[PDB]
Amino acid sequence: VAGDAIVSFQDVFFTTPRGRYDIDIYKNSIRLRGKTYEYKLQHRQIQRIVSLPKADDIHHMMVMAIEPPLRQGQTTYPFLVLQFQKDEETEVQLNLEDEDYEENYKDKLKKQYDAKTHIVLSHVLKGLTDRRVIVPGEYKSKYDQCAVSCSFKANEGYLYPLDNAFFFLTKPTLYIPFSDVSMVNISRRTFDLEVVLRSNRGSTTFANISKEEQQLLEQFLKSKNLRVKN
Ligand SMILES: [Cl-]
Ligand SMILES: [Cl-]
Ligand SMILES: [Cl-]
Ligand SMILES: [Cl-]
């Protein structure tokens, strides 16, 4: 039961971990309730929240970085990836007493929402967890996209140059803050982008990015104060 939750999002599709979960949100925790696994995640465990559209024009994604990572049986998840039909909507009233709403939440939550599901979820997460929801910034690829196709290790994905980070989706998911970057290395009709980390923590290469995309990537990263050698 979840009668005690402030608000629940029922039957949400997560692509990682793969399955459908209810998301019961409380003042200091979220309970993820699946068919096989249930997990109580502290708000403190949520390091980052990213909301972005899929290349689809059908789906919207939300991504939560989790530390310590979520567990199901033996196996460990540093990122939760949730997926929504971009047009589905949610109408919901928060289960908060009026005085409790007024004392603690009047400036960061509404009592009633009626909006796209991912937008309601963003707002409730912001208000309850006090985290920023990161959205795609000024970067816009040669063909007016938020991201470029490439691979990390063998793994085909998309790299989003966000305003303050590199973000790779979806297998595996990686988030590298710019404040963790020592420098970038562009080597060669595709190119490889090496993100060298500070504190001798190594480097992460995003391989086989279209060459057409090099110049705008280079300029955006330099405008963000990163050392870009090519
Ligand atoms: Cl769905
Ligand atoms: Cl379920
Ligand atoms: Cl709680
Ligand atoms: Cl809103």
Side-chain angles (χ1 to χ4, degrees), residues 1-187 189-230:
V1 181
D4 52 350
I6 294 162
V7 57
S8 296
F9 298 78
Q10 292 175 238
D11 197 21
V12 172
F13 186 45
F14 285 59
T15 50
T16 299
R18 192 51 64 82
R20 312 199 65 85
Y21 297 84
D22 301 347
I23 305 181
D24 304 320
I25 310 181
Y26 296 85
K27 64 176 197 250
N28 199 34
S29 70
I30 294 171
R31 182 171 294 100
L32 301 181
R33 291 185 288 114
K35 210 216 153 55
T36 307
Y37 300 101
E38 166 172 66
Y39 183 80
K40 177 199 199 186
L41 162 83
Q42 301 292 335
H43 291 175
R44 207 163 185 273
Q45 282 171 271
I46 302 160
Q47 298 308 294
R48 314 259 173 201
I49 307 169
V50 191
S51 184
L52 21 67
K54 264 198 104 272
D56 277 25
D57 204 18
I58 306 175
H59 304 110
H60 198 96
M61 286 180 291
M62 290 181 63
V63 181
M64 295 186 95
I66 306 300
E67 169 60 19
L70 178 144
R71 286 190 148 263
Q72 302 182 145
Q74 215 51 22
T75 137
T76 224
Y77 300 94
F79 298 88
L80 309 178
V81 182
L82 305 59
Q83 188 183 279
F84 301 93
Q85 278 72 74
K86 83 171 209 288
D87 295 319
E88 90 156 54
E89 291 175 355
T90 292
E91 172 180 61
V92 66
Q93 260 184 73
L94 303 201
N95 174 43
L96 287 174
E97 273 163 301
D98 281 354
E99 171 83 353
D100 184 41
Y101 172 83
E102 214 93 285
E103 280 276 329
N104 303 117
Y105 290 119
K106 61 158 44 167
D107 282 317
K108 51 222 221 174
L109 295 168
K110 292 184 207 254
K111 301 168 103 162
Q112 310 187 1
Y113 289 92
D114 192 350
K116 286 172 189 176
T117 301
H118 70 87
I119 280 148
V120 177
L121 180 64
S122 270
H123 195 266
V124 165
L125 283 168
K126 273 187 213 188
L128 285 171
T129 71
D130 262 347
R131 309 307 197 211
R132 159 166 200 191
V133 172
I134 297 161
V135 292
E138 71 143 288
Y139 173 78
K140 291 190 219 218
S141 72
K142 196 198 177 72
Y143 300 119
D144 211 36
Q145 309 286 334
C146 295
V148 296
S149 188
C150 62
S151 62
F152 161 86
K153 261 63 157 76
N155 302 292
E156 293 261 59
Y158 277 96
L159 176 69
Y160 296 70
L162 303 169
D163 285 3
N164 290 303
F166 300 100
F167 187 51
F168 180 85
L169 291 163
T170 195
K171 185 225 255 97
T173 299
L174 309 173
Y175 189 95
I176 311 159
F178 289 164
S179 76
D180 277 2
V181 182
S182 174
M183 72 180 302
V184 178
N185 282 324
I186 307 305
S187 65
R189 271 197 214 157
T190 68
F191 75 94
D192 289 349
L193 190 144
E194 193 191 30
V195 193
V196 184
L197 275 1
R198 299 169 178 267
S199 313
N200 297 327
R201 278 149 58 261
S203 67
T204 293
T205 310
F206 301 105
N208 304 145
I209 304 169
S210 182
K211 200 154 201 65
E212 327 210 308
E213 249 83 357
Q214 185 173 314
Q215 158 134 45
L216 289 178
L217 198 45
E218 263 191 35
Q219 67 169 225
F220 174 74
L221 299 172
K222 285 178 179 163
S223 80
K224 290 301 179 194
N225 307 322
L226 305 168
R227 210 321 203 180
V228 185
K229 169 77 178 195
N230 79 65

